[PDB]
Structure 1
Amino acid sequence: DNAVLRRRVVGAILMVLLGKATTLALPFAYKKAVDAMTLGGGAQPALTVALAFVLAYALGRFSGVLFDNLRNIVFERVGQDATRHLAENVFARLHKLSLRFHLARRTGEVTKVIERGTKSIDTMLYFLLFNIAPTVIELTAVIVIFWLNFGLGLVTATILAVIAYVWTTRTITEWRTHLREKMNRLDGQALARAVDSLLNYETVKYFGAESREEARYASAARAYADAAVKSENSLGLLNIAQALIVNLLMAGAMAWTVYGWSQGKLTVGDLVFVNTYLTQLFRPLDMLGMVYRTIRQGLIDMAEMFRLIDTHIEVADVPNAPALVVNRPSVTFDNVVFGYDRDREILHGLSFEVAAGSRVAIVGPSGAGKSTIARLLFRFYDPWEGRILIDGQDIAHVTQTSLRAALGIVPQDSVLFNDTIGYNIAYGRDGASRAEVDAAAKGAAIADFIARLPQGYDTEVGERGLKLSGGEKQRVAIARTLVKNPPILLFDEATCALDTRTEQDILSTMRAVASHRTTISIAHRLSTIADSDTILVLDQGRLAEQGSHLDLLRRDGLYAEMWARQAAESAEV
Structure 2
Amino acid sequence: NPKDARHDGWQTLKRFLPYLWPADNAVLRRRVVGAILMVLLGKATTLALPFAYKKAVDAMTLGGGAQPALTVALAFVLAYALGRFSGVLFDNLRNIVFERVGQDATRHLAENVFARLHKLSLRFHLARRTGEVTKVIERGTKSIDTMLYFLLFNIAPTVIELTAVIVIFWLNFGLGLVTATILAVIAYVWTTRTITEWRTHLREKMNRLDGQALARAVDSLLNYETVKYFGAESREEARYASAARAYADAAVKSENSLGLLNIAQALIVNLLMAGAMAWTVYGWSQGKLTVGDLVFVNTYLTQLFRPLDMLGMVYRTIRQGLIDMAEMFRLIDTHIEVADVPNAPALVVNRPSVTFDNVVFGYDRDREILHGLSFEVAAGSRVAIVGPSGAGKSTIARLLFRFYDPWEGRILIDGQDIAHVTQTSLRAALGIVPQDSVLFNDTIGYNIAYGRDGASRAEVDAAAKGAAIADFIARLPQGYDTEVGERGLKLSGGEKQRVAIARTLVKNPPILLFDEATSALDTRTEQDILSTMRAVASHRTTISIAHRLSTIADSDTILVLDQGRLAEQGSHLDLLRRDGLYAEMWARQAAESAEVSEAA
Contact 1:535/1:546, CA 8 A, preserved across alignment:
yes
- 1:389, distance to aligned residue in structure 2 (A): 2.5
User: Secondary structure, in 3 states, of the residue corresponding to 1:301?
Assistant: helix
- 1:63, distance to aligned residue in structure 2 (A): 2.6
- Taking a change above 3 Å as real, the CA distance of residues 551 and 232 of structure 1, as seen in their structure-2 partners, is farther
Contact 1:15/1:71, CA 8 A, preserved across alignment:
yes
Contact 2:54/2:295, CA 8 A, preserved across alignment:
no
- 1:190, distance to aligned residue in structure 2 (A): 11
1:338-357 Cα offsets, whole Å, 9 max, x none, are 33234544333333322222
- 1:275, distance to aligned residue in structure 2 (A): 0.6
Distance 2:239 2:341 in 1: 46
Contact 2:60/2:69, CA 8 A, preserved across alignment:
no
- Taking a change above 3 Å as real, the CA distance of residues 70 and 422 of structure 1, as seen in their structure-2 partners, is same
- Taking a change above 3 Å as real, the CA distance of residues 321 and 197 of structure 1, as seen in their structure-2 partners, is farther
1:24-81 Cα offsets, whole Å, 9 max, x none, are 4434444444434434699953332453354334333333333333333333333333
Distance 1:293 1:464 in 2: 36
- Taking a change above 3 Å as real, the CA distance of residues 11 and 381 of structure 1, as seen in their structure-2 partners, is same
User: Secondary structure, in 3 states, of the residue corresponding to 2:285?
Assistant: coil
- Taking a change above 3 Å as real, the CA distance of residues 540 and 200 of structure 1, as seen in their structure-2 partners, is farther
- 1:463, distance to aligned residue in structure 2 (A): 2.0
- 1:496, distance to aligned residue in structure 2 (A): 4.6
Residues 319-338 of structure 1 mapped to structure 2, 5 A cutoff: 319-338=342-361
- Taking a change above 3 Å as real, the CA distance of residues 156 and 282 of structure 1, as seen in their structure-2 partners, is same
Tell me the equivalent position of 2:126: 103
- 1:117, distance to aligned residue in structure 2 (A): 3.7
- 1:410, distance to aligned residue in structure 2 (A): 0.5
1:398-452 Cα offsets, whole Å, 9 max, x none, are 2221211111101100011222222211111111123322322222122333334
1:274-322 Cα offsets, whole Å, 9 max, x none, are 1111111111344457545544333222112333445254322233333
Contact 1:117/1:305, CA 8 A, preserved across alignment:
no
Alignment identity in percent? 100
User: Secondary structure, in 3 states, of the residue corresponding to 2:569?
Assistant: strand
- 1:201, distance to aligned residue in structure 2 (A): 14
- Taking a change above 3 Å as real, the CA distance of residues 458 and 133 of structure 1, as seen in their structure-2 partners, is closer
Say which is worse superposed, 443-452 or 99-108, in terms of deviation. Answer: 99-108
- 1:560, distance to aligned residue in structure 2 (A): 1.2
User: Secondary structure, in 3 states, of the residue corresponding to 1:309?
Assistant: helix
User: Secondary structure, in 3 states, of the residue corresponding to 2:331?
Assistant: coil
Tell me the equivalent position of 2:3: none
- 2:253 counterpart of 1:230: yes
Distance 1:197 1:387 in 2: 55
- Taking a change above 3 Å as real, the CA distance of residues 20 and 403 of structure 1, as seen in their structure-2 partners, is same
Distance 1:303 1:184 in 2: 23
Contact 2:51/2:296, CA 8 A, preserved across alignment:
no
Say which is worse superposed, 227-236 or 526-535, in terms of deviation. Answer: 227-236
5+ residue gaps, structure 1: none
- Taking a change above 3 Å as real, the CA distance of residues 507 and 287 of structure 1, as seen in their structure-2 partners, is closer
Distance 1:554 1:113 in 2: 59
Tell me the equivalent position of 2:516: 493
Say which is worse superposed, 153-162 or 137-146, in terms of deviation. Answer: 153-162
Contact 2:385/2:545, CA 8 A, preserved across alignment:
yes
Contact 2:193/2:312, CA 8 A, preserved across alignment:
no
Distance 1:222 1:308 in 2: 40
Contact 1:106/1:192, CA 8 A, preserved across alignment:
no
Contact 2:373/2:565, CA 8 A, preserved across alignment:
yes
Say which is worse superposed, 504-513 or 365-374, in terms of deviation. Answer: 504-513
1:191-244 Cα offsets, whole Å, 9 max, x none, are 999999999999999999999999999999999999988877777666655544
Contact 1:108/1:195, CA 8 A, preserved across alignment:
no
- 2:403 counterpart of 1:403: no
Tell me the equivalent position of 2:15: none
- 1:529, distance to aligned residue in structure 2 (A): 1.0
Contact 1:417/1:464, CA 8 A, preserved across alignment:
no
- 1:175, distance to aligned residue in structure 2 (A): 7.0
- Taking a change above 3 Å as real, the CA distance of residues 451 and 572 of structure 1, as seen in their structure-2 partners, is same
5+ residue gaps, structure 2: 1-23
Contact 1:418/1:462, CA 8 A, preserved across alignment:
yes
Say which is worse superposed, 542-551 or 437-446, in terms of deviation. Answer: 542-551
TM-score by length of 1: 0.82
User: Secondary structure, in 3 states, of the residue corresponding to 2:201?
Assistant: helix
Residues 372-391 of structure 1 mapped to structure 2, 5 A cutoff: 372-391=395-414
Distance 2:85 2:92 in 1: 11
Contact 2:361/2:406, CA 8 A, preserved across alignment:
yes
- Taking a change above 3 Å as real, the CA distance of residues 281 and 419 of structure 1, as seen in their structure-2 partners, is closer
User: Secondary structure, in 3 states, of the residue corresponding to 1:536?
Assistant: strand
- 1:515, distance to aligned residue in structure 2 (A): 5.2
- Taking a change above 3 Å as real, the CA distance of residues 222 and 276 of structure 1, as seen in their structure-2 partners, is same
Distance 2:240 2:348 in 1: 52
User: Secondary structure, in 3 states, of the residue corresponding to 2:410?
Assistant: strand
- Taking a change above 3 Å as real, the CA distance of residues 80 and 426 of structure 1, as seen in their structure-2 partners, is same
1:482-529 Cα offsets, whole Å, 9 max, x none, are 111111100123235668887566544544554542111122332221
Contact 1:336/1:350, CA 8 A, preserved across alignment:
yes
What is the root-mean-square deviation in Å for CA atoms of aligned residues?
4.7
1:79-134 Cα offsets, whole Å, 9 max, x none, are 33334333333333332232122346554554444334433333333334334543
- Taking a change above 3 Å as real, the CA distance of residues 98 and 465 of structure 1, as seen in their structure-2 partners, is farther
Tell me the equivalent position of 2:202: 179
Distance 1:100 1:193 in 2: 34
- 2:463 counterpart of 1:440: yes
Say which is worse superposed, 300-309 or 281-290, in terms of deviation. Answer: 281-290
- Taking a change above 3 Å as real, the CA distance of residues 570 and 173 of structure 1, as seen in their structure-2 partners, is closer
- 1:552, distance to aligned residue in structure 2 (A): 1.6
Aligned residues: 573
Tell me the equivalent position of 1:78: 101
Choose which of 456, 468, 475 in structure 2 pairs with 1:452.
475
Say which is worse superposed, 299-308 or 423-432, in terms of deviation. Answer: 299-308
User: Secondary structure, in 3 states, of the residue corresponding to 1:49?
Assistant: helix
Distance 1:206 1:493 in 2: 41
Contact 1:94/1:310, CA 8 A, preserved across alignment:
no
